[PDB]
Amino acid sequence: QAEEWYFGKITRRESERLLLNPENPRGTFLVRESETTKGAYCLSVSDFDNAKGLNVKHYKIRKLDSGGFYITSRTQFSSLQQLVAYYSKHADGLCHRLTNVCPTSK
């Protein structure tokens, strides 16, 4: 099951098709499991600039072997939920805090 943020091992192209919906607001995020980089996730957020348009910013979720998950060497969480939940309020490294999760239709 794609639990809100955790869509699973969806490839970049599949994710882009979902994120690049003009009806998506800035802050649309989701975490994919990278098969092209095993042991790593990707919190991909859809940004919006009135000069670039809707642009998907692929942040990388690195794994600590004695810690958990972290997108940047600042905030580190022992679970994916713990990560997104915090980054929803404090972007910390992202340009925009996690606002809404990418909507699917299947």
Q: What is the 3-state secondary structure (H, E, C) of the chain?
A: CCECCEEECCCHHHHHHHHCCCCCCCCEEEEEECCCCCCCEEEEEEEEECCCEEEEEEEEEEECCCCCEECCCCCCECCHHHHHHHHCCCCCCCCCCCCEECCCCC
42 backbone dihedrals φ, ψ, rounded to 5°: -140, 110
Method: NMR
Domain span holding position 103:
1-106
Residue among 41, 36, 40, 38 nearest 5 (CA): 41
Tally of domains in the chain:
1
- C-beta atoms surrounding 104 within 10 Å: 10
Asked if residues 46 and 22 have their Cβ atoms less than 8 Å apart, the reply is no
